[PDB]
A paper describes a structure:
Ferritins are well known as an ancient superfamily of globular proteins that are associated with the storing and detoxification of iron. In addition, they exhibit a capability to oxidize Fe2+ to generate Fe3+; and ferritins facilitate iron nucleation as their mineral core for storage inside the protein cavity, allowing the accommodation of up to 4500 iron atoms. Previous research has indicated that the marine invertebrate Apostichopus japonicus ferritin (AjFER) shows very high sequence similarity with other invertebrates and comprises known conserved functional domains of both the di-iron ferroxidase sites of the H subunit and the iron nucleation site of the L subunit, suggesting that AjFER is functionally similar to M-ferritin. Structurally, each subunit of almost all ferritins is composed of a characteristic anti-parallel α-helix bundle (helices A–D) and a fifth short E-helix (with the exception of Dps proteins) pointing inside the protein cavity. These subunits assemble into a spherical structure with octahedral symmetry, resulting in 12 two-fold, 8 three-fold, and 6 four-fold channels.
In this study, we prepared a triple AjFER-E25A/E60A/E105A mutant (MF), a double AjFER-D129A/E132A mutant (M3), and a single AjFER-E168A mutant (M4) by site-directed mutagenesis; heterologously expressed the three mutants; and further performed detailed structural and biochemical characterizations using a multitechnical approach. Generally, numerous experiments have implied that eight hydrophilic three-fold channels in most ferritins are considered potential gates for the entry of metal ions into the cage with the assistance of highly conserved residues, such as Glu and Asp. As previously described, the negatively charged residues Asp129 and Glu132 are located at the three-fold pores of AjFER and play a pivotal role in Fe2+ translocation to the internal cavity of the protein, at which Fe2+ ions reach the ferroxidase center. Accordingly, we prepared the M3 protein by site-directed mutagenesis and solved the crystallographic structure of the mutant at a resolution of 1.98 Å. The diffraction dataset of the M3 protein was integrated into the monoclinic space Group C121, with unit cell parameters of a = 192.83 Å, b = 130.95 Å, c = 122.62 Å, α = 90.00°, γ = 90.00°, and β = 119.40° and with twelve monomers in the asymmetric unit. Being mostly consistent with the structural features of the D127A/E130A/S131A ferritin variant in BfMF, the inherent hour-glass shape of the three-fold channel in the M3 protein was even wider than that in the previous holo-AjFER protein because of substitutions with relatively smaller alanine residues.
Residue numbers in the entry:
A (entry chain F), E (entry chain L), F (entry chain L): 3 to 172
B (entry chain K): 2 to 171
C (entry chain E), D (entry chain J): 2 to 172
The structure:
Amino acid sequence: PSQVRQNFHELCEAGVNKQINLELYASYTYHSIAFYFDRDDVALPGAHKYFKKQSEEEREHAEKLMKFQNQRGGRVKLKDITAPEKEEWGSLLDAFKVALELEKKVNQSLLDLHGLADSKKDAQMCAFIATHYLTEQVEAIKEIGDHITNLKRVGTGLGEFIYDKENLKE
Amino acid sequence: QPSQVRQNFHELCEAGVNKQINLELYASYTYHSIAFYFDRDDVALPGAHKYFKKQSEEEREHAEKLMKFQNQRGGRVKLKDITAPEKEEWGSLLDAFKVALELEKKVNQSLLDLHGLADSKKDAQMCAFIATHYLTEQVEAIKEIGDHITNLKRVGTGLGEFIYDKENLK
Amino acid sequence: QPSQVRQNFHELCEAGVNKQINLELYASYTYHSIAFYFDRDDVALPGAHKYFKKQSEEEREHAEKLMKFQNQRGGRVKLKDITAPEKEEWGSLLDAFKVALELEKKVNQSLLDLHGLADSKKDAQMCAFIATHYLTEQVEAIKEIGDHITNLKRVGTGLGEFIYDKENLKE
Amino acid sequence: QPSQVRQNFHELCEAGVNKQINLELYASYTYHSIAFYFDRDDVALPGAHKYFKKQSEEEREHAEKLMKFQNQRGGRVKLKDITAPEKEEWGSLLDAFKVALELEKKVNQSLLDLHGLADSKKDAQMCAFIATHYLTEQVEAIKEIGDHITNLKRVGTGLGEFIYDKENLKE
Amino acid sequence: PSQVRQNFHELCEAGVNKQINLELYASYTYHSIAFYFDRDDVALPGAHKYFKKQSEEEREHAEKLMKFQNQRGGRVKLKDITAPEKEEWGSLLDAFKVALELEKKVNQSLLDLHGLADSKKDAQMCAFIATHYLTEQVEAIKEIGDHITNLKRVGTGLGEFIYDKENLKE
Amino acid sequence: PSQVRQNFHELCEAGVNKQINLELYASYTYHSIAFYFDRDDVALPGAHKYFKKQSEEEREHAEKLMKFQNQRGGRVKLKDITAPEKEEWGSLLDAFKVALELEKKVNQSLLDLHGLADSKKDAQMCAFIATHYLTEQVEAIKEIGDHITNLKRVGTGLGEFIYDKENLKE
Ligand SMILES: [Fe+3]
Ligand SMILES: [Fe+3]
Ligand SMILES: [Fe+3]
Ligand SMILES: [Fe+3]
Ligand SMILES: [Fe+3]
Ligand SMILES: [Fe+3]
Ligand SMILES: [Fe+3]
Ligand SMILES: [Fe+3]
Ligand SMILES: [Fe+3]
Ligand SMILES: [Fe+3]
Ligand SMILES: [Fe+3]
Ligand SMILES: [Fe+3]
Ligand SMILES: [Fe+3]
Ligand SMILES: [Fe+3]
Ligand SMILES: [Fe+3]
Ligand SMILES: [Fe+3]
Ligand SMILES: [Fe+3]
Ligand SMILES: [Fe+3]
């Protein structure tokens, strides 16, 4: 075993590797969404900028887990990053509904990971997940919630143009 | 018809937050009373006046942060009457701090109960929120009030109350 | 019996001030409720959340100024239960501002009554305090809310609500 | 019909760009793996960790510029799975830069093929794009990796690896 | 019972007092190691500086636990500080292996203390330990793992001089 | 024998090692006194700060002697640090009387060490001790004498609060 490994269970190591893959998957999906809004027949630059940023942040989420794996003396194990569900994402509202479903799936994954760590009495790993993931996920779901509400409010056409400029770009 | 953001948030936890919101508001109202008691012409302790107004304001912030939490998790804020404080007149500086210590310990037990409920429903995010934002401020507040009581017993009545008020509360 | 500072301050006027203090806190709590309703994920109007949060804080300040006045005059603050707000849910931006107009007019009438009472007891300093600090703020608040209602009717539902919230309430 | 912006852009060139995007992402993921390998407690080379993290990031930028180019020309981005890196463990600093040279040359050949395809369809825009942003960075990248390999052979294993990591990669 | 004491078990109070002694014992060991590297026949100034700093940090760890004891209304009980295991600590690599051993020993003590807190539903004591101690320890252990790896890599003689200058002095 | 050793007797080397232990024992006593004044039922923050600072200075005194040991080519030999004489230290005036006792005890130890140096014609060790230790000790003793006198003058209760604020906190 690694010289630094202490109170770190093989199932927890495995759970971190699974979460790294899911974070990379979310990153790639937002990347797809970002460049969909950059198409000449879509042309919502606020969404393009917003989802690009989201993609970057999800990559940082993966890196912090890779960093965590090494601190605890686990070994990073990488799998393929599955291509996103769709090639085209529809409206601003459609894209946000996809984002909410993705964020809730990631959140349930992190809640299962936390539960795993608690079951093995990994107090460090519980603290780490609670401090860096669980509140960002709640805040992210709430933010997407609000976007969906406002996108239904502003409607289609001019409303989308304005929401894109005022709320995603600025 | 669950909230679109709601995930791993029990109805009993929702109700527990609403109960804590009322308790925080109640504490704010009690400090407000105490603050204006020390502004009476026949009491006239400006340090205490300023101290307890600030305590009132902080308790209102504690309530707001739980209202914010309730909305983040997709629960619904339900407001009740704020009960008038226990007394119209609060006696000496020492008497007011003995009241505060009893209040803080009451609020603390309520936060420990609320944390216990969250843990019993495996609401790991709610555990972290309460630990991060409430449990250590409560411990620091109780210790601070203990030190105040100790010092108010030491300085005694009359000149000591005037000095303590100027040196430690103002 | 009376405070060493008390001069020309009738017990009915002392009682009137305690009743105004309660009304101010009641209005604070109502705006607080409204503020957190606009922060719900299924309403999500951040401009209104911010506006009503500030209104809540202001009304608490109006209560504090009265508690401070009570003590200046040597009256004694007497606090009562702060009644829960009328509604749990407040509907549209328009519905919320219509509630505010109603609330602000109720508070105004109460202050005008209190001023009446002060004058009936020839409490000139109390008349001056009420006129100086409350009667014009009240007039200005009711005008401001009237303008809000007019503009919320003009912009309509949907896009207009989003724009009004961002342009007028947030900024 | 075709995109309103599409002019002188062949479907095989579109396909080529999509294949290059996947390759750039593949390269990015490989450098990511290498980066975190050097962060292991039993490898502990902080310069190389920082260096390969930065290489991972730049490759992702290379991918983004081609997606941007795809949309500029009125083509459509088609994403495929990103294949996991070929190894879990990357050996020495020298071994890692040997993998990097192999990878950089493979990507260069794919860019030279893409350029040949552009020229074959008389896509002057695309030739110029590839030559301006890709062909020279790739030559510079290969030269840089070549110099790293030579220097890592010069310095030894052991002390030399620590010194090179701190003096050359941590910069 | 202290006026401030609430939800603080005697066994948790005892464990805090045990931890304080352990923190002070680590401090004294680091102090010894620091002054060994200052001997004219050892003369590694980077190590002297580094281990002095480690000695100072461990004393701070002890202080934070004494402060916590008082905050919770426990009473600080102090025991002899046992002299370090050796008078002489060998090579840079020998000293770092001692450090990894010590840090892993301390960490197990903190994981046990956290376990005790949890067994008594001391929610605030769990938060305290995880926030201030559990992640610091995992960072400390990883950093020492990294030192050992690099000290094996650089070898003895010239490598030790350079490591001491380039990594420990800076 | 150390390459650096010249005109340094074994008995002087032994006395330096004795002094180091005494400096560390004083440091630990001051640490105990410091954290007693931090208890919720004592709560004298000026004393807490003052005795913490004294604790830090005594550790520095120990360090300077370990440095001197190494400069002269003696070898540092460390012994257990004996727990302080009391767990509880009474009044501000009680703690200062303990301090005068401790400081006079240390000073006699330094005067004996100086005597030993002189008996071995260790001219540089006489200079070291007189320069760094003998006048500091006389200043320390006078300052504590002054505290005791002023603590008798101010009396208990209000006087202790004011002295703690006005003299020890500043
Ligand atoms: Fe994420
Ligand atoms: Fe890193
Ligand atoms: Fe996310
Ligand atoms: Fe509170
Ligand atoms: Fe808010
Ligand atoms: Fe409180
Ligand atoms: Fe008002
Ligand atoms: Fe005031
Ligand atoms: Fe108003
Ligand atoms: Fe590239
Ligand atoms: Fe772009
Ligand atoms: Fe490249
Ligand atoms: Fe420690
Ligand atoms: Fe302190
Ligand atoms: Fe440590
Ligand atoms: Fe000393
Ligand atoms: Fe030194
Ligand atoms: Fe001293």
